[PDB]
Amino acid sequence: VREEDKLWTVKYAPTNLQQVCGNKGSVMKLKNWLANWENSKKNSFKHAGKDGSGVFRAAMLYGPPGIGKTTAAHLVAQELGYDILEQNASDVRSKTLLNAGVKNALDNMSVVGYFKHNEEAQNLNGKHFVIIMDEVDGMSGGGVGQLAQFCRKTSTPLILICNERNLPKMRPFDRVCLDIQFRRPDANSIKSRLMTIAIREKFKLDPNVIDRLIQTTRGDIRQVINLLSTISTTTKTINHENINEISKAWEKNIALKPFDIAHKMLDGQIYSDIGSRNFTLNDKIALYFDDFDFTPLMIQENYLSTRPSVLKPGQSHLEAVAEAANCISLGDIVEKKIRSSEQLWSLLPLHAVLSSVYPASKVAGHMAGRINFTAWLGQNSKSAKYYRLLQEIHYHTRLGTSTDKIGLRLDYLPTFRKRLLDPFLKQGADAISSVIEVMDDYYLTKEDWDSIMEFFVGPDVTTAIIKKIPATVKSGFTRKYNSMTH
Amino acid sequence: AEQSLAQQPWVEKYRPKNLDEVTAQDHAVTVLKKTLKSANLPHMLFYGPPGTGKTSTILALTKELYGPDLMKSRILELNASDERGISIVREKVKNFARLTVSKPSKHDLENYPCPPYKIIILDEADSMTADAQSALRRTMETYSGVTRFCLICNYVTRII
Amino acid sequence: LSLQLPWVEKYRPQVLSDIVGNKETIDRLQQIAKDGNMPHMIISGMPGIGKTTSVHCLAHELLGRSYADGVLELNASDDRGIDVVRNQIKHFAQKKLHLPPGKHKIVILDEADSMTAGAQQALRRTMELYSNSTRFAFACNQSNKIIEPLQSRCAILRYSKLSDEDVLKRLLQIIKLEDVKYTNDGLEAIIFTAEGDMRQAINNLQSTVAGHGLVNADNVFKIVDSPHPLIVKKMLLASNLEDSIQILRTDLWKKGYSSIDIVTTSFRVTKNLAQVKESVRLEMIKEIGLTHMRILEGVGTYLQLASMLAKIHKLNNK
Amino acid sequence: KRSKENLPWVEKYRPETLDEVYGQNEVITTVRKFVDEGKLPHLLFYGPPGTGKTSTIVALAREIYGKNYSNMVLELNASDDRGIDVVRNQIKDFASTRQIFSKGFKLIILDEADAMTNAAQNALRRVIERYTKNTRFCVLANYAHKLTPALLSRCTRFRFQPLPQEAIERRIANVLVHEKLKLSPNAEKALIELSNGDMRRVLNVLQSCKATLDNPDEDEISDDVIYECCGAPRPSDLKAVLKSILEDDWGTAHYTLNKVRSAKGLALIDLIEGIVKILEDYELQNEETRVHLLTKLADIEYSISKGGNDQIQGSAVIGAIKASFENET
Amino acid sequence: MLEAKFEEASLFKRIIDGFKDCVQLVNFQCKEDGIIAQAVDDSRVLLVSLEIGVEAFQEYRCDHPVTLGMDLTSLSKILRCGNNTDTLTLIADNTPDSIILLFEDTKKDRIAEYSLKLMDIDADFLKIEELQYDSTLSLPSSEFSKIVRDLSQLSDSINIMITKETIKFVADGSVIIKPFVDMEHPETSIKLEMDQPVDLTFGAKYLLDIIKGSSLSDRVGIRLSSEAPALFQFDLKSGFLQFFLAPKFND
Amino acid sequence: MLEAKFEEASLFKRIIDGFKDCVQLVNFQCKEDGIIAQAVDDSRVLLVSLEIGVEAFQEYRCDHPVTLGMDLTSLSKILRCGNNTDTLTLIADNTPDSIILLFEDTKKDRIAEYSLKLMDIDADFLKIEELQYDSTLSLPSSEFSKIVRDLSQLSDSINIMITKETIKFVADGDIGSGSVIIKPFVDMEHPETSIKLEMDQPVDLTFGAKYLLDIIKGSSLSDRVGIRLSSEAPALFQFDLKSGFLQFFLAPKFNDE
Numbered sequence A: 001v002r003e004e005d006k007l008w009t010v011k012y013a014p015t016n017l018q019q020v021c022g023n024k025g026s027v028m029k030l031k032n033w034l035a036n037w038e039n040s041k042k043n044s045f046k047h048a049g050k051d052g053s054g055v056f057r058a059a060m061l062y063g064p065p066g067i068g069k070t071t072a073a074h075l076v077a078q079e080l081g082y083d084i085l086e087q088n089a090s091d092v093r094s095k096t097l098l099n100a101g102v103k104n105a106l107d108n109m110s111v112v113g114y115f116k117h118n119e120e121a122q123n124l125n126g127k128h129f130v131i132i133m134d135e136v137d138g139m140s141g142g143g144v145g146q147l148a149q150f151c152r153k154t155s156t157p158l159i160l161i162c163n164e165r166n167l168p169k170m171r172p173f174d175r176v177c178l179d180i181q182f183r184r185p186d187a188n189s190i191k192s193r194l195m196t197i198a199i200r201e202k203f204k205l206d207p208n209v210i211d212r213l214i215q216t217t218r219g220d221i222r223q224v225i226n227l228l229s230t231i232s233t234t235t236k237t238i239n240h241e242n243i244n245e246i247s248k249a250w251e252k253n254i255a256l257k258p259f260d261i262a263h264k265m266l267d268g269q270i271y272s273d274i275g276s277r278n279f280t281l282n283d284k285i286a287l288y289f290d291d292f293d294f295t296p297l298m299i300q301e302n303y304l305s306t307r308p309s310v311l312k313p314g315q316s317h318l319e320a321v322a323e324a325a326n327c328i329s330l331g332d333i334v335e336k337k338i339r340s341s342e343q344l345w346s347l348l349p350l351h352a353v354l355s356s357v358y359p360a361s362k363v364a365g366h367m368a369g370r371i372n373f374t375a376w377l378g379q380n381s382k383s384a385k386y387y388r389l390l391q392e393i394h395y396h397t398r399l400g401t402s403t404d405k406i407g408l409r410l411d412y413l414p415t416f417r418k419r420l421l422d423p424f425l426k427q428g429a430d431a432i433s434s435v436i437e438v439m440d441d442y443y444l445t446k447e448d449w450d451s452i453m454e455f456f457v458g459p460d461v462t463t464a465i466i467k468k469i470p471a472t473v474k475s476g477f478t479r480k481y482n483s484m485t486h
Numbered sequence B: 001a002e003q004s005l006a007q008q009p010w011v012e013k014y015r016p017k018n019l020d021e022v023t024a025q026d027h028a029v030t031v032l033k034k035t036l037k038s039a040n041l042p043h044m045l046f047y048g049p050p051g052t053g054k055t056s057t058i059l060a061l062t063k064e065l066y067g068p069d070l071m072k073s074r075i076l077e078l079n080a081s082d083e084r085g086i087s088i089v090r091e092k093v094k095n096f097a098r099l100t101v102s103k104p105s106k107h108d109l110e111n112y113p114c115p116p117y118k119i120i121i122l123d124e125a126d127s128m129t130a131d132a133q134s135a136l137r138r139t140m141e142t143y144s145g146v147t148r149f150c151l152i153c154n155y156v157t158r159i160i
Numbered sequence C: 001l002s003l004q005l006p007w008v009e010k011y012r013p014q015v016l017s018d019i020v021g022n023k024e025t026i027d028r029l030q031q032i033a034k035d036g037n038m039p040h041m042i043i044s045g046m047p048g049i050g051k052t053t054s055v056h057c058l059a060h061e062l063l064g065r066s067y068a069d070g071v072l073e074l075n076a077s078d079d080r081g082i083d084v085v086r087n088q089i090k091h092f093a094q095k096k097l098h099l100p101p102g103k104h105k106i107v108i109l110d111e112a113d114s115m116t117a118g119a120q121q122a123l124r125r126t127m128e129l130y131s132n133s134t135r136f137a138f139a140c141n142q143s144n145k146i147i148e149p150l151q152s153r154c155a156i157l158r159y160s161k162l163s164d165e166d167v168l169k170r171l172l173q174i175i176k177l178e179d180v181k182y183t184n185d186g187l188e189a190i191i192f193t194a195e196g197d198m199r200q201a202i203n204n205l206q207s208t209v210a211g212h213g214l215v216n217a218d219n220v221f222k223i224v225d226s227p228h229p230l231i232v233k234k235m236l237l238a239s240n241l242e243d244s245i246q247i248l249r250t251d252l253w254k255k256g257y258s259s260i261d262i263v264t265t266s267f268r269v270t271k272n273l274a275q276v277k278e279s280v281r282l283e284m285i286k287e288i289g290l291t292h293m294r295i296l297e298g299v300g301t302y303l304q305l306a307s308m309l310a311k312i313h314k315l316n317n318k
Numbered sequence D: 001k002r003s004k005e006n007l008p009w010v011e012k013y014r015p016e017t018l019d020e021v022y023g024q025n026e027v028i029t030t031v032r033k034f035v036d037e038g039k040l041p042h043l044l045f046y047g048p049p050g051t052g053k054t055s056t057i058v059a060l061a062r063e064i065y066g067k068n069y070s071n072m073v074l075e076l077n078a079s080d081d082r083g084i085d086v087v088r089n090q091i092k093d094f095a096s097t098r099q100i101f102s103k104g105f106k107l108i109i110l111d112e113a114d115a116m117t118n119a120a121q122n123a124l125r126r127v128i129e130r131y132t133k134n135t136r137f138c139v140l141a142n143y144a145h146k147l148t149p150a151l152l153s154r155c156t157r158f159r160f161q162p163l164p165q166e167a168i169e170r171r172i173a174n175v176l177v178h179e180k181l182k183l184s185p186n187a188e189k190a191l192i193e194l195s196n197g198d199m200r201r202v203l204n205v206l207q208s209c210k211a212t213l214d215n216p217d218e219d220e221i222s223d224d225v226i227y228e229c230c231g232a233p234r235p236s237d238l239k240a241v242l243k244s245i246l247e248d249d250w251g252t253a254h255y256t257l258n259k260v261r262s263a264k265g266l267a268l269i270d271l272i273e274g275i276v277k278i279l280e281d282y283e284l285q286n287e288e289t290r291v292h293l294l295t296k297l298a299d300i301e302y303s304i305s306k307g308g309n310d311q312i313q314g315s316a317v318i319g320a321i322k323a324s325f326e327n328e329t
Numbered sequence E: 001m002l003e004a005k006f007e008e009a010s011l012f013k014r015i016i017d018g019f020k021d022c023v024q025l026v027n028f029q030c031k032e033d034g035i036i037a038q039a040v041d042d043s044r045v046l047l048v049s050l051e052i053g054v055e056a057f058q059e060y061r062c063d064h065p066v067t068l069g070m071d072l073t074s075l076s077k078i079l080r081c082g083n084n085t086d087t088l089t090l091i092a093d094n095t096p097d098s099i100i101l102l103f104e105d106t107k108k109d110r111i112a113e114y115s116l117k118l119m120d121i122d123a124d125f126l127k128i129e130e131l132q133y134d135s136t137l138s139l140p141s142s143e144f145s146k147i148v149r150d151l152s153q154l155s156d157s158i159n160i161m162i163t164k165e166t167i168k169f170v171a172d173g174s175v176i177i178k179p180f181v182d183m184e185h186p187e188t189s190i191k192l193e194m195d196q197p198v199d200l201t202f203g204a205k206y207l208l209d210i211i212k213g214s215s216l217s218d219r220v221g222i223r224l225s226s227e228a229p230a231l232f233q234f235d236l237k238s239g240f241l242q243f244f245l246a247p248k249f250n251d
Numbered sequence F: 001m002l003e004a005k006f007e008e009a010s011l012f013k014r015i016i017d018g019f020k021d022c023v024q025l026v027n028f029q030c031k032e033d034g035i036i037a038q039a040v041d042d043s044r045v046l047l048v049s050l051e052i053g054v055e056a057f058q059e060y061r062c063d064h065p066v067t068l069g070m071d072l073t074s075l076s077k078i079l080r081c082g083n084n085t086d087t088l089t090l091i092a093d094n095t096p097d098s099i100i101l102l103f104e105d106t107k108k109d110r111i112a113e114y115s116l117k118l119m120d121i122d123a124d125f126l127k128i129e130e131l132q133y134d135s136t137l138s139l140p141s142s143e144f145s146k147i148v149r150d151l152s153q154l155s156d157s158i159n160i161m162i163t164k165e166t167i168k169f170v171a172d173g174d175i176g177s178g179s180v181i182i183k184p185f186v187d188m189e190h191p192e193t194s195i196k197l198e199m200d201q202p203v204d205l206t207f208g209a210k211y212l213l214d215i216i217k218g219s220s221l222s223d224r225v226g227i228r229l230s231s232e233a234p235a236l237f238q239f240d241l242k243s244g245f246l247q248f249f250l251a252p253k254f255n256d257e
C-alpha cells in the first residue's frame, strides 16, 4: 500500500455524491431512479413516475469523456448499499458469452453480500446486483442487440455507460431503456476542487487561469488534473505569465463527427484572410482525413443549404453553387477511380480537395438551418430494393416480354397498369375474372401485383388509389387467386 | 483437319501458319526469323493497333520453333479467360517459369530447332493490374535461362 | 569478419542527459525519473527526433537492473491484436513484482498509431485499474490515430522538430568523439539537407565521412543529393514558364526522378504554400491532381509535367 | 544445350563484380569503401528503371561473402509474398539467428519494396533497427513515395543517376569487343539519344540491329538500321514535317504528314515526342504560345493513350501547332 | 519461505481439476495448520473454498503465513506437464513474486522445476463462520451428478424441495427421493436432518460445474436454508471442498 | 537411366512425412552409393539432409550421377494417391526429365504410372558434418518430444545447456518458466532408454520453439534421437534409419546480452 504512488486521479476521486462537480440535476435524477427502482418493480414497471422514470428498467449514461460517468455510477450504487457488478471492454462480450456469464447473474442473488453485513438492518437491497455495463461503444468482438434484449427481461438495476449516443450501431437503445445526458461542466464547479487541490499540494494556482484550463480541455476534468500534476513537478507557479504555452502545447485533438465536420468546413470564418493562416489548408485536409467515409456525402448533402460570405464581386449564389457541384462531380470521378481496380489509394488527398474542400470554400458562409443528415445512403438502399423487384418481375415475364430489365420499366408498366388496375376501378369486382387471365399469361402472382403498382411516379401514384377501392374486392381477389390452380 | 479449316470464317481460315505468310511487319519478322538460327531470343513486347498480326505471328513463331508436337507442352498462354491476379502470377506463372524444359523427342529435335527454353505468353497484358506486372519483374528476370516472356498489347502506356 | 555498429546505433544515447531534443520535455522526464512517480504519457512527433530512445532511457533509469523483468515492450513486429492485449498485457499488469518504493512497472507500446481501435478500447480499463503497479507509455508518430479515451487518460507530451543548434551540437560531439576532419560549410550543408532529422543527419555524416574523409560542401552536395521538396518549391514559384521548365528539366528530370514522385511532391508542397492565396492554391492543387490522374493511367512522360507547369503558370499569372 | 550464349543480351552481359558497373561511379566508390573499411549501414537504392541497382547489390553480395551469394543472403523480391504475416515470421527469424556456413553479418535484400503494404513497412520499421549488430537491410526502389517516411529515414539514401553518355559509350565498346560487330558514330549518337538512360533498351535495339544485318560480321550498323529496328522517326523527316506544318498551308501539310507517316509506318505518339523535343529549343518571344503549345499537345497525347482515332489526332496536332504559332505574329 | 511436499501429484491434480471451470483466480492462504483457499466466480454467484491439512502433505514447512494469488488456467497448463508418478513440491521465498512447482522422480534422475508468476488480487477474505442451516442431507455424489445431468437437459432452472423428510428435484422433469439408511452399504446411506420445509431454486451451469467435483468424494453433503446460500461439501483424505451457491428470485 | 525399386510402399511415405511441412523444394541426387538430398528452409534457418543407401531398396540401378529437383507438395500429392500395399519404383530417363513414380501391386495387375515435372533448382550442393562438435548426446525420441512440446507452451525460445554430466532444457516466457534437467545413465535390461553424453566443453545456446516442434515430427522414424551441439556451429538433430539417416541442421538464436 502507498499514498504517493497514486496517479493523482484515484487519491482525489469523489468518495461521495456531494463531490461530483457538475451536472447536479442528472445525478440527482439517476439517484431518485435507482432509489425508486424497487417501488417501480412492485408495480411491474407499468406506472410512470413524476418524471416518467419508473417505466424503464435500465439506465443509460452518455456524454463527453472525462466527466464522472463511471464515478457517478459507482458511487450511486455504493451509497444505496447495493452490490456492484462491473463488466468492461477488456472482458470478452458477445451474445454467447453474455448469455453464458452475466445472464445467470441477471436474476440471481449475491453470494459475497450475504457475508458482508447482516446483523443490523441497514437495508433490504444489500443482497442484490447492479450490473454496470461500461464502454458499450467498443463491441469489436451480440454487442448491442443482446444487451438491448437484456433491458426488457431484467430483474436487477441495469446501468449502461457509453460515450456517444447517436452512433448508428447502438440505435436499439433508443426507447427500450431510460437515458440521461451528462454535459461538459462549467468553470464554477471544478474551481473549488482545483483550489483545494492547490492548497493541499503547496503550489500556486491563480483563480483566473482555471477558466482557460477548462477551455483548452473542453470537458475532461481528468485531463485538467493530469495537466496540473505533470507540470507541478518542476513549475509550482501556474499563472497568466505562462498560461499561453500550456494552452498551446496541451490542446485536445478530438475526432470530428459528420455533423461537426460539416459545420466547421462550411463556416465562412476559416476561408477569410485572417483565418486562412490560423487554420491552414493542411488542417482542412486532415479534417477530411478524420472521416473519409461520410464527409463527401455530408458536403454534397448540405453545400447549397447555406448563405455564403466569400462571394466574389459579381458572382451570385447560383454560380458558386454551380462551381461547387462541378467540383463535386470531379471528386466523384476521382472517388470512383480510387475504389475501382488497381487499388489506387495514393489519390486520396486529391479527392479530399475536390469533393470536400473546394465546394465548401466556394459556398463558405453562415449556415441558415441545421446540419441535415445525408440522404444518398437511404436513396441507394431504396434504389437497390426496387432494382431487385424489377429484376424479379423481368425474369418472371422474360418468357413473353423479350425485353431487357430497362425497357420494361420505362414502357411496359404504364400499359400493364391500364390492363391490370383499371378494370378494378371502372368495372369493380366482376373484372376479377379478366385481370387474372392476364397475369397467368406472364406467370405473375399476388406478390408481383403488389410490387408493380409501387413503381409509378409523378401524376400516376398508385399507393393512394389502392386505398380507394373497396376492401371486399381486396379480400375476394386474393381468395379467387389462391383457390384457382395455374 | 482440312474440313475443319474449311468450316470456319475467313479470319481463321487464312491465319498465317509460318513466318512467311505474315506480310505486314518486315522489321520484326526479320528478327524473329534470324532468332531461329541463333538461340538468344529476348523477352518480346509486341504492341500496336488492333488487328495487325501480333497474336497471329507469335503462334507462327512458336510453331516454327518447337513444332506441333512440343508446342502443347513447351508453352504457357495467359490471354484473357484465365484469372490473372497477383496470387496467380505469383504462384502458377512462377511455377511454370521455374520449371525444367521438357525432353525433345528425336523427331522434333531432328526436324525443328528446339531451343533450351520454354515460352510464357501473356496476351493483352494491358488488362493486368499494376501489382501483377510489378510481381512479374523478378520472376521474368531470374529464370531467364529456361523461360522467355512475350507480352502483347494495344497500348504500351498501360504497361508499367 | 567483424562488422562495426553504425554511427546511428553505436552512438545511441544510453543516458537521458545525452538527449539534445526539446529541453523542457526532456527536463520533465529527467525530474520524473529522479522522482519515480511516472504517469501514463503519449510521445508523438516528426519521424527521427528521439522519442523511442527517450522513453527507453527513461525506463532503463527508472528500473535499472529490473529492466529485464519490469518492462514489457510491444512493437509493430510483435502481435498487437485483441487477443494479445487481452491476455498477455493483462497477465503482465497483474504480475506481482517487488520493486523499490518509488518505482513502477512500465509498458512500452511503440508505434501506437498502428493498433486497432478495439485494442485501445480493451486497454483502457486494463490501464486504469492497475495504476498502482503499471504505467503505460505510448510512442507514436500521429497522435490523431489514437482513440480519445486512451489519449485523455495519459498526460500528453508533444515533441517538436530539432532546431539547427541541437543538430549542430550533436554533430560536433560525434566529430569530436570520432576524430574526423571537417569544415563549417560541410556541417551547414549536412544540417540543411537533414531537414531536421537526427538519424538522417548522422547517416549522411557517416556516408560522406567514409566516402571522402573531408566533410566539405562539395562532398556532401555530391553524395547526399540535397532534399527534393525544396527544389519543387523553388520550381513552382518561378516568374516565367521558361525558368520553371528549365528547373524541372535540369534538377528533377535529368537527375533521374520518376514523374509520379515529382507530382506527389509538388502536391505536398502546394498543400503547405503559405505565400500564395487560398483560391490559387485550390486551383493549383486541382490541376496537379488532374496531372496525377493522367500519370497514374501509365502516360508519365516529360510533356505531362511540362503542361502541368504551363497550366500552373497560366493560373498564377491571371 | 544450355550455355551462356543462349541468354539474351539484357542478362548475358550482367555485371559480375562492381568493376563492371559503369556510370554510378560516385556510389560504387562509396560502397567499395564501405565494404573495405568494414562498416556497411542499411542501404536504400533509388533510381530510374534499368540503372544498375539490382546488379550492384548482387555484385556486392558476391564480393562480401563469396562466389555463392544466394546461400547466407536472403532476398525478397516482388515474386514472394511480403505481407505483415511474412515480415513477422520469416524476416524476423532470419534476422534473429546466425548463419549456417560462416561467421559474418547477414544480408537481407528487399528488392522493389515500393510494392509493400503500409502495415508491412510499419512492422519492418522496428525489426530493421532492433537487430542491427547482426543483419543489414538493403531497400531497392523506383518510386520514393510508396515508402513511409520512417522507413525512408532509417536507411542511407543512394540515388542512381541515369547513365551519362560516356558510360553507355564504354558499355557499347565493351559489347562490340566481345561480339564481332561494327557500329557507326552517328548511329552511336542516335542510339545514345534514344536510350533515355535505359541500359536495357540499348542492348535490346543493339541485338535487333545485329539480327537485321544478314551477316553480322562485316557490314556496319548504320543509323538507318537503328531507326528501322525501333521504328523511331529519323530527325530528317521529323524536321521536314515540322517545317511543312509551320510554313506551308493546310492541304499540303496534311498531305506531307500522311506521306511521311506512311513511308515507314511511323506512329503519331513518337512524332509528337520528336516534335516536342525539337521545338523545345525555339525562342518564343511570348509566354502564351508555349502554354497552349504544351497544353493541347499533352491533351492529344493523353487521348492517343486511349487509341480513339488515327487521322483526327494527326490533324489535331497540326491544328494545335498552327494555332500556338499564331500569337507570335 | 514455505515448502510443501506431496506424496503423489495426482491428488493436487484432481483437486485443481475439480473447480478449474467456475473461477479463474484463487488466493491460497498458507498457515501453520494447513492451506485454505477460496475463490469467487467472475459473476459473483458461486464461491469455491477448500481446506487441506498437513495429513495430505508428505512434508510441510511454513514459517510465516503467506497469501498466494494465482491463476488457474496457467496453473493447470503447468500441472499438465507433470506425471502421476512424480513427487510434487511447492516452494515459495519471502515476498513470493514467484512460486516453484517441482516434480521429482523417485526411480529416475529427472527433476523438473516450473516457476509461476503470481497475481495481485484484492484479498477481501470473507469469513465462513457457521450459520445454522435448516436442512442437512448426505447423498452419493454419483447419483447427484446423474440426476442433475438429467434435469439440466430439460431447462436451466431447478427447484429443490425438502418437505416431510422427502426430497424433490424439479426441472421446469421431477425426481423424488426418500431417506433410506442401510447398514449393509453405508456409501448409499442417504441421510437427512430437517428442521423446516425448505424451498430453493438454482441455475443449471452452477450445478453442472459443481458436480464436476464429484470425483474426490463418493458422498456429498448438501445443506439448505431458505434465506442462505446452499452449501455443497465434498470430503477429502485430509481436508474438504465446499461450494456456496446463491439462491434465485422468488416468483 | 535410373531405376530404384523399394521393398515396400509406406517406407517412402513415412520418410517424406518427416519434413513434409518443414521444407518446400528438395533435390535428390542419385548415385551408385544411394539417394542423397539436402534442402534449405524457406527462411534459411534449418537444413534437412537425408541419406538412404542401397539397403532399403529392393533393386537399385544408376549408371551416372543424376540430380532431380522437385517440390514436396506435389511429391506428397503423388505419394498420397498410391495404396500402401503396392511396390514403388522411381524411374528416370537418360537426361533428367519428369520423374516416373510407378506403383505395382503384388497380386493383381495395377500399374499406376505418375509423372512429376522437375524444377530447375540451382545445384549448390553443400558439405557439412565434417566439423568437430563440442558435445554429443543421444536420448529416446519420446522423452525429447515430450520435453520440447511441454516447454513450447511457456515460451517461443528454448535454451539447451550441456554442463558436466548434466543436460538442461530451459524455457523462459511471459506466464512462467520451466527447467528440465537430466543426467546420463545406461540400463542393461533396456539399452534403448539409456541417455548417452560425451562432452569436451560446456555449451549453452538457444533455439526457437517452432523449428523444434517441426523437427520432432521426425520422431516417427526412429526411437533414439542424437543431438550434436557446438558453439558457432549448427545444431545437428539426427534420426537413424535402418539404411541411412535424416539430419536437421538448426541455427542457434544469438543473445543480445
Ligand SMILES: Nc1ncnc2c1ncn2[C@@H]1O[C@H](COP(=O)(O)OP(=O)(O)OP(O)(O)=S)[C@@H](O)[C@H]1O
Pocket: A008, A009, A010, A012, A013, A014, A019, A020, A021, A022, A064, A065, A066, A067, A068, A069, A070, A071, A072, A163, A193, A221, A222, C149
Ligand atoms: N465532476 C467531477 N468532480 C471531480 N472529479 C471528477 C469529476 N468528473 C471526473 N472526475 C475525475 O475523473 C476520474 C474518473 O474518470 P471518469 O470521468 O469517471 O471517466 P468516464 O466518465 O467513465 O469517461 P470515460 O470512461 O474515460 S469515456 C477521477 O479521477 C475523478 O476524480
Ligand SMILES: Nc1ncnc2c1ncn2[C@@H]1O[C@H](COP(=O)(O)OP(=O)(O)OP(O)(O)=S)[C@@H](O)[C@H]1O
Pocket: B010, B011, B012, B014, B015, B016, B021, B022, B023, B024, B025, B049, B050, B051, B052, B053, B054, B055, B056, B057, B153, B154
Ligand atoms: N500481318 C498479317 N498478315 C496476314 N494476315 C493477317 C495479319 N494481321 C492480321 N491478319 C489476318 O487477320 C486475322 C486476325 O489477326 P490477329 O493477329 O489474330 O489479330 P490481333 O493482332 O491479335 O489483334 P488483337 O487481338 O485485337 S491485339 C488473322 O487470322 C489473319 O487472317
Ligand SMILES: Nc1ncnc2c1ncn2[C@@H]1O[C@H](COP(=O)(O)OP(=O)(O)OP(O)(O)=S)[C@@H](O)[C@H]1O
Pocket: C007, C008, C009, C011, C012, C013, C018, C019, C020, C021, C046, C047, C048, C049, C050, C051, C052, C053, C054, C141, C170, C198, C199, C202, D150
Ligand atoms: N535528441 C537526440 N539526441 C541524440 N541523438 C538523438 C536524438 N534524437 C535522435 N537521436 C538519434 O536517433 C537514433 C534514435 O532515434 P529514434 O528514437 O529511433 O527516433 P524516433 O523518435 O523513435 O522516431 P521514429 O521511431 O524513427 S518514427 C539514435 O541513433 C540516436 O542517437
Ligand SMILES: Nc1ncnc2c1ncn2[C@@H]1O[C@H](COP(=O)(O)OP(=O)(O)OP(O)(O)=S)[C@@H](O)[C@H]1O
Pocket: D009, D010, D011, D013, D014, D015, D020, D021, D022, D023, D024, D048, D049, D050, D051, D052, D053, D054, D055, D056, D142, D171, D199, D200
Ligand atoms: N551501370 C550499368 N553498367 C552496365 N550494365 C548495366 C548497368 N545498369 C544496368 N545494366 C544492364 O542492365 C541489366 C539489368 O540491370 P538491373 O540492375 O538489373 O536493372 P535494375 O537496376 O534492377 O532496375 P529495375 O529493377 O528494372 S527498376 C544488367 O544485366 C546489365 O546488362
Ligand SMILES: [Mg+2]
Pocket: A069, A070, A134, A135, A161
Ligand atoms: Mg468509464
Ligand SMILES: [Mg+2]
Pocket: B054, B055, B152
Ligand atoms: Mg491479339
Ligand SMILES: [Mg+2]
Pocket: C051, C052, C053, C110
Ligand atoms: Mg522509435
Ligand SMILES: [Mg+2]
Pocket: D053, D054, D111, D112, D140
Ligand atoms: Mg531491380
